[PDB]
Ligand SMILES: CCCCCCCCCCCCCC(=O)O
Ligand SMILES: CCCCCCCCCCCCCC(=O)O
């Protein structure tokens with residue numbers, strides 16, 4: 001209406017408004033202390049309240065962009081602290097708003113956020129919950145200036161619920177620590193996924209994004225007509241292009257408009273939206289993004305008629321190649337919620353290659369009549385990989401599955417540093433836990449969602465400090481080919497075994513005292529180094545050295561003496577292992 005700030009305060013409600021304002025300033029003024037942000041917030045909040053009381057009071061008709069910038073240019077130390085950013089204050093809107101956007105700092109050189117002790121946290125939570133919660137909201141927002149503000153707020157609400165539940169339990173730490181591990185891991189994943197999609201959009205362009213979305217949205221909304229999916233993809237692409245440009249309010253507005261459009265047209269989109277569409281503005285787009293797949297239409301034909309049989313395949317294709325290809329994707333994806341989106345794209349791309357050849361030929365129908373046979377192998381390759389890995393997981397359990405992976409990936413790419421091997425194998429292991437639990441029909445999507453980030457973090461680590469041609473080869477492939485390429489890496493037979501180091505395989509009795517998580521990391525570090533030193537060792541030779549170690553550890557950790565048993569028996573295990581391998 002007349003006052004943007006007032007309209008945002010009425011839609012969001014006071015609590016949400018204050019938190020979002022905190023996150024928004026935090027992400028720009030990343031070196032200002034917490035107490036200075038409490039001050040901005042209270043100042044922006046009292047102003048907003050005067051506009052609620054009276055839409056036409058002084059300054060209430062300014063744009064939110066204008067007010068945000070004005071507030072930013074009001075910080076006294078802005079030049080001293082942020083430098084270039086203060087020169088934005090000399091510009092007029094809209095140039096000013098675009099100048100602020102260029103001058104966020106992505107790596108503010110801030111010490112990492114240490115998780116205090118449980119009783120320290122729960123005491124702070126009891127004494128000043130709002131301070132505890134917003135001080136940490138500030139610390140996270142300042143460290144992740146591109147984390148979509150409303151999503152960060154959603155996380156904060158889950159942290160609050162976990163403190164609320166767990167700080168009253170019998171065993172506080174056993175309740176809370178798993179929840180914070182889970183929240184940290186989801187927050188880190190959500191953050192890398194937001195960054196990867198914007199990098200993808202720029203790298204692979206808008207067509208590939210649109211392909212990706214058609215497939216994802218047809219799986220979610222299989223009852224929708226194609227033209228509806230297509231409308232939603234066009235808008236989704238807009239949203240995501242604006243969101244990647246980094247202006248939070250424009251992003252939020254475009255997301256809200258789309259959410260509104262979907263809710264006003266549920267009957268044309270999906271039967272699963274009722275609940276999301278009843279929620280308030282703030283939660284609506286987020287709830288829509290998480291909704292489960294609608295049940296597909298009861299009795300659907302095979303895609304044979306429209307895409308192989310029908311005489312107007314080549315004619316329908318040449319007329320609008322991407323509409324046609326998109327229709328194929330839609331039809332394939334709606335009947336296959338059980339595939340990864342990239343599988344579906346491999347498929348679509350196979351059908352594209354095939355129409356480009358076959359529509360150029362004398363009898364098109366006969367050239368391409370067997371195109372669906374070429375999909376069988378593509379579909380089976382990830383299905384088999386899921387079978388093999390989830391069966392191997394069941395008989396081994398998370399920890400020893402990771403170890404199976406260590407051995408396997410270290411023999412594949414032994415040039416990779418031991419810490420990157422450990423972390424990536426530990427992580428792949430967790431993707432095996434999370435996703436081999438799901439029923440068959442959600443396994444491949446799950447694994448996709450999670451491998452995409454585990455693999456992109458492996459690549460970014462590695463392209464910022466490189467070691468293996470192959471790894472680079474797979475990381476600079478198409479994003480459809482990324483995972484298959486990694487899967488095809490073979491044991492490196494041109495690797496020169498790493499020279500023995502005494503210390504690497506020396507263990508002191510502190511390891512009997514380390515936490516579960518840390519003792520595994522120490523063991524897994526040694527396993528990697530063991531495989532680096534003797535790459536030729538077989539699975540049974542390695543199991544003999546590993547089961548020898550398993551009996552070395554526990555038969556010096558319950559003993560009348562400790563660090564002697566580790567010094568003296570640890571000479572015996574090492575020389576016996578060197579001889580055996
Ligand atoms: C966006 C969340 C705002 C509130 C977070 C409150 C709890 C902070 C817990 C301590 C830091 C956690 C780091 C970690 O989980 O490893
Ligand atoms: C004075 C500065 C105010 C900054 C407040 C930021 C408000 C973000 C609005 C988010 C609304 C949710 C829309 C959505 O993501 O669907």
Ligand SMILES: CCCCCCCCCCCCCC(=O)O
Pocket residue numbers: 207210211214230233234322323325326345348349352
């Ligand atoms: C009006 C166009 C809106 C977007 C929906 C139809 C076109 C989407 C692109 C589909 C092409 C991808 C095929 C492929 O390369 O695998």
Ligand SMILES: CCCCCCCCCCCCCC(=O)O
Pocket residue numbers: 340342343382385386389390405428429431432435444447448451483484
């Ligand atoms: C070693 C980690 C095992 C994780 C669970 C199995 C996942 C197998 C790969 C399937 C990935 C689907 C993405 C794709 O289609 O390329």
Ligand SMILES: CCCCCCCCCCCCCC(=O)O
Pocket residue numbers: 385409412413416420421424428458483486487488
């Ligand atoms: C340094 C670690 C590089 C190796 C990690 C590649 C894992 C990606 C594929 C995971 C699922 C398939 C298992 C496989 O075939 O290897």
Ligand SMILES: CCCCCCCCCCCCCC(=O)O
Pocket residue numbers: 403505523524526527530533545546547549550573574577578
């Ligand atoms: C060349 C000296 C080799 C000495 C023995 C090193 C063994 C290190 C890896 C042990 C990991 C065992 C994991 C387990 O099954 O508990």
